[PDB]
Design a binder for this molecule. Structure first.
Ligand code: NAP
Ligand code: NAP
Ligand code: NAP
Lengths: 330, 330, 330
């Protein structure tokens, strides 16, 4: 009956908590780090039995302080793809994940954790295979390396181990994420303030805004998590995206067109938006050269094969919906 | 026989200590943090058995260093609503509270603790139910989450669990609270120093000074605590206010008129005070936008239904008396 | 045919040039100081024969560089009531006026010049008599003293000498005046930028926004000027105000209601606007204490008796038109 969500105050974690709550699961231990306070807003409409700081958790879990725990959704991680202290990164992501996993295996708790497509780096295949993994930054490396450990532990594991390589995740509860929030959230606040949105210009062969990613709503991230939570016999590392890749232009053009409908104005093509200065491009930062993915697209074979067969919200549906939820404040 | 008050050197905890002394209860263990040394003034006219820093107390209380303890008045918390380190807020408030609760439950000691009307946030109703609780800042969240825990502990709880959601408390012994002391106290000093008082202006559709709160003197706060102390059979989460919501304008008008009256001057209406420059309005801080409660009014129903039928001082009686008490200094 | 206007690129001067332009007079020497370049806008739709800086003008004028000159409209002065260098103020205002006056007398030219109601200081009568004149700042004194000199020179003067004590003037071509522009102009920009307007709070027994002035449109100012221009037989020093005094609140509220009417919204009362936060009050600046007129109202007796019988635009007609015109930039 007792559930544990780490990263609970965060974008994905709190979304999981909300989804658990909505199916009546409420005996939840929330673990996070509230040093940046505003995250708390994410848990205000939630039901949990306890809160701990990430520094007090592991040793108390291991000790059995929370009793009989059914599952741990391990979303807690430093998600700053620009953080430079790799020692911190490896301790806070990799080592920590390991102590959590060891505690789950020692107790028979299901272990559902967040991985990242950043692991793929500049690959042209996105299949859950070591062969094609080569992360561009130390964040991606911390995730990559934990995935390697998972592959060694999985065959001998009697309790569930399910890892999700989230792609570009967007949706409610990311408001606190700063520069690490999604492009859609960024585009939203930009249009509210300056009446126009921003995207990176040309870089490494891709036109302005033509860099493409697989954008997934949290709604679908939470659905997938619950599916494997419900099937403790399914273990593995799974891509979690839509299998459909789109340029950043679609995010921007969509956010703009949806904010215009909310005020009466008719939809515009991307080109009209650029023409009218509704979309403008910022020159690509030197700090991100060689460390940036210009293309990602989930191969969906593995996830579908495991029996998750529901459709995924498209950019059009999901971003439009997300902007409207965002607009819900005036 | 041994009593313990945390927050002992602060506003409400020191009023509790004195109230206990005024009934021959003097075997008190006092717990606070004297880093800001001026607080000591709150215990000079008091009788206590011991003083401990908040950091060395929880260890000694569980270990039973204080012998048999009848009750704990857990008033100690970080009361700075603008404190921004949520990790500290959750540790010093929430986690600390649970530890005190756990030791209290372990030893069958009564547990009377301070909550806060901040928990209700911008809600339209003020009844002790999860459905109207939405805190606006992390301070509120730390009080909120402890209350949720108490609702899970309570049914099984052998011993007394008394939690009081204080509203806007004013009165003596709050002199050290700086920017967190009551508006009454601020106005007094302001008047003494500049010959005028200040209030926030228009914010969120409330006119200047027209934001409204439920103001309760400490005296009433101290009576309610003693009542539940005398009644270990009574347990619950109670609103502690007067049921009567007044605008900030009233406090100021009262402070100005009481201070005028102390110098043989006639009373003015608010409309005269504003026209005379005795009341002026500072524009509303952007640091408070969306984090500020514009309306509170205690729903007394649950507190009455527990046998506390005594009447509460009004703003006119309480502020007047407090202002006169303050005027005692030269 | 040759006409001179000092302060030509400033507020009143440029209105004189345009009005003269509109009855066929285009033989105009313009004299100003364009260091703050933006005043140049004031002359764009105008016809002038020459432009000189104020520092090179007087020598050339007295020497006869401009040939026969019918009249000089002397509007050029430092109009910063908050300027603290009184040596500069007396040189740029008082001595400059005397040098221009002398040259006029010797050439036989009409001399129309700007005085100021600032001359009356905190007086309770506003008649053109020495007995009720006592300026509060050095600006006022520079005009005050010059007027005394005119009263000595006028008896045996062969050409026209007309001096106008402008009250609070408002209207187009004051965009460059900064903190010295009319309150109507300030409110317009305050409202366009923040959807609310600012006025001074209580000072010296006048409530928030209650200090009153005699507000006169530049159109009337230009009209009175043109009248005496037409009648060289009339000399003297005259009040140029409406005879009607309103509080600043009237200006504020008239500006708000007029802008609201343009966005379709309904008109509000002053107390409504104050309660809604549309009008807020700034603490009176110490730098103005004892240097600030709380009341002005022109006694029109002398102006009428000289022949000027026309009606003056009131605040409601004038400010409304000023606001609509100002709104013409979008
Ligand atoms: N598009 C996406 O959002 C995306 C894509 C790929 C992977 N992911 C993964 O999704 C997970 C959650 O991401 P998110 O979007 O929700 O970011 P997030 O909002 O920052 O959530 C993470 C929260 O957990 C905290 N935390 C960090 N390390 C922790 C630890 N060792 N134990 C417990 N809590 C910890 C973080 O706070 P502090 O860091 O300040 O301590 C943060 O508040 C991460 O594992 C991330 O790698 C997300
Ligand atoms: N208007 C009100 O007065 C109001 C309204 C709602 C709730 N409350 C609650 O009433 C209680 C008392 O508030 P107050 O007005 O008396 O403010 P206070 O004067 O600041 O009292 C708290 C004192 O306890 C200290 N303290 C902080 N954390 C502690 C801990 N974990 N253990 C022991 N002592 C600790 C504080 O010092 P440091 O913070 O410097 O460490 C402070 O001296 C608080 O819990 C507050 O949340 C008050
Ligand atoms: N509320 C009112 O509008 C009001 C009330 C009473 C009297 N007045 C008088 O009306 C006249 C015009 O005022 P205004 O509202 O039009 O202000 P203005 O816009 O500042 O116009 C005056 C212009 O004359 C320039 N100037 C200063 N000294 C000069 C000089 N010795 N010779 C030639 N030009 C000079 C000024 O530039 P710099 O100063 O930067 O050098 C300024 O550009 C002033 O004499 C003023 O005292 C106005």
């Amino acid at each position: 009956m007792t559930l544990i969500v780490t990263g609970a105050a965060g974008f994905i974690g709190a979304n999981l908590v909300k989804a658990l709550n909505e199916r009546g699961e409420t005996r939840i231990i929330a673990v996070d780090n509230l040093t940046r306070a505003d995250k708390f807003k994410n848990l205000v409409d939630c039901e949990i039995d306890d809160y701990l700081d990430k520094t007090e958790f592991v040793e108390r879990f291991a000790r059995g302080d929370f009793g009989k725990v059914r599952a741990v959704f391990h979303e807690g991680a430093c998600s700053d793809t620009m953080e430079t202290d790799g020692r911190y990164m490896m301790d806070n992501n990799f080592r920590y994940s390991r102590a959590v996993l060891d505690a789950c295996l020692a107790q028979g708790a299901q272990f559902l954790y967040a991985s990242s497509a950043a692991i793929y780096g500049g690959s042209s295949r996105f299949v859950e295979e070591r062969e094609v993994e080569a992360p561009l930054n130390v964040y991606g490396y911390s995730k990559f390396l934990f995935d390697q450990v998972i592959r060694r532990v999985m065959p001998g594991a009697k309790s569930q181990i399910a890892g999700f390589r989230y792609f570009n995740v967007y949706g409610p509860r990311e408001s606190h994420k700063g520069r690490m929030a999604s492009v859609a959230f960024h585009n939203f606040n930009q249009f509210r303030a300056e009446g126009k949105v921003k995207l990176f210009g040309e870089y490494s062969g891709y036109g302005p805004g033509e860099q493409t990613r697989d954008f997934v709503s949290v709604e679908d991230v939470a659905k997938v998590n619950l599916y494997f939570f419900d099937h403790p016999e399914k273990s593995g590392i799974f891509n979690l995206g839509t299998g459909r890749a789109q340029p950043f232009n679609d995010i921007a053009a969509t956010v703009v067109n949806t904010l215009r409908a909310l005020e009466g104005q008719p939809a515009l093509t991307l080109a009209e938006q650029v023409e009218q200065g509704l979309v403008e491009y910022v020159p690509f930062p030197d700090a991100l050269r060689g460390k940036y993915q210009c293309f990602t697209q989930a191969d969906q074979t593995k996830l579908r094969a495991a029996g998750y067969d529901a459709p995924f919200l498209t950019v059009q549906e999901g971003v439009d919906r997300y902007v409207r939820w965002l607009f819900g404040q005036l």
